[PDB]
Write a protein that binds this ligand. Structure first.
Ligand code: 6KP
Ligand code: MN
Ligand code: MN
Length: 366
């Protein structure tokens, strides 16, 4: 079984023995002592702990291989002139197929971000959005896959005009620096200070204006948990708690030519249940129904309005507002820097395995 062009074969079927490709494996950085962390690689007890979780790492790897194959496909066809809806639907159709979508056991971890220009995060079109991708746009493609709630959160930036090349390089460098600095017992604020230093070492010129690239100070990387995109630890991307063995992190950075701060803007598309809210009885019929739909289809994973539409739901906006007002669901609106600014993002998921650091979502692309 080989992969088709366009891709349509589940990653499952490409690896029938259920053993999926590893990502980039790295020795942990030297300790603050100045001494090596390489002992973890060859420690018999760390090897045992690591193997005890091989099923889990393998689930992440299946999800990451789906992510790699989806994004290579996206990069081959994404072009100005396509609607944002067309882009997201074409991406998601591929993602569903390769992940072998199966209820809450395998599927899409969160909606496809395609945030444009000064918008950095959490834009995906709602129904009727006529927005078309433009030649001068800078588009952040941020999408997620999961197997058994083991989530790959991984993102890149798309451009067509070379004027943004150095901005993209700054952010890629910053993200890779954060990944490099990450490790067991490493302080989160230190990972963030390293990212800032690299990002701000770049100056760029766009349409005759110069800028020192700024990290977006109120966006940040995060720990990841089972069915939990943000498990409660945050990684700053400006100057300001430790990472721990067995944790999983999304290392993302955002660079901006604007103020380096984002605000909520535009219509909301992204929503997610509050992870910590349990059973809440609801009699209101449309609200009750929508919560049941959400519980069945998404659980604690994020969703968007288009995904409710595709399930055949309609007249749900008041019901959704009700769930938000009750605190059962939280809205995650688009996050934008100032009008006229440009933002870029790169993001990987990393596994802090007992023996090594695995950049599980690394590809030959980024
Ligand atoms: C930014 C954020 N902040 C949070 N505070 C508590 N839980 C949180 C979850 C998120 N978060 C999300 C929410 C909704 C979605 F659709 C995609 C994400 C997402 N990607 N990386 C982090 C993400
Ligand atoms: Mn992301
Ligand atoms: Mn993230």
């Amino acid at each position: 079984k080989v992969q088709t062009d366009p891709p349509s074969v589940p990653i499952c079927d490409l690896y029938p023995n259920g053993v999926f490709p590893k990502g980039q494996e790295c020795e942990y950085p030297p300790t603050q002592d100045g001494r090596t962390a390489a002992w973890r690689t060859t420690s018999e007890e760390k090897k045992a702990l690591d193997q005890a979780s091989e099923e889990i790492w393998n689930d992440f790897r299946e999800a990451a291989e789906a992510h790699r194959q989806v994004r290579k496909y996206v990069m081959s066809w994404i072009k100005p002139g396509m609607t944002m809806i067309e882009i997201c639907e074409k991406l998601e159709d591929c993602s569903r197929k390769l992940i072998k979508e199966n209820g809450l056991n395998a599927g899409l971890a969160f909606p496809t971000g395609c945030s444009l220009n000064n918008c950095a995060a959490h834009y995906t079109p709602n129904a009727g959005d006529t927005t078309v991708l433009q030649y001068d746009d800078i588009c952040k493609i941020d999408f997620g896959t999961h197997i058994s709630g083991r989530i790959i959160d991984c993102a890149f930036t798309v451009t067509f005009n070379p004027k943004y090349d150095t901005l993209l390089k700054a952010v890629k460098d910053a993200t890779n620096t954060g990944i490099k600095c990450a490790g067991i017992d490493v302080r989160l604020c230190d990972v963030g200070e390293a990212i800032q230093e690299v990002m701000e070492s770049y100056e760029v010129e766009i349409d005759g204006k110069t800028y020192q690239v700024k990290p977006i100070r109120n966006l940040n990387g995060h720990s990841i948990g089972q069915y939990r995109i943000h498990a409660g630890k945050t990684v700053p991307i400006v100057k300001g708690t430790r990472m721990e063995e067995g944790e999983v992190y999304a290392i993302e950075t955002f660079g901006s030519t604007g103020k380096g701060v984002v605000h909520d803007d535009m219509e909301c598309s992204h929503y997610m249940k509050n992870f910590d809210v349990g059973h809440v009885p609801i009699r209101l019929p449309r609200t009750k129904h929508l919560l049941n739909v959400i519980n069945e289809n998404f659980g604690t994973l994020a969703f968007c309005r288009r995904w409710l539409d595709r399930l055949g739901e309609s007249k749900y906006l008041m019901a959704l507002k009700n769930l938000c007002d009750l605190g059962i669901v939280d809205p995650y609106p688009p996050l934008c820097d100032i009008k006229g600014s440009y933002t870029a993002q790169f993001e990987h998921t990393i596994l802090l395995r007992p023996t090594c650091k695995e950049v599980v979502s690394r590809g030959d692309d980024y």
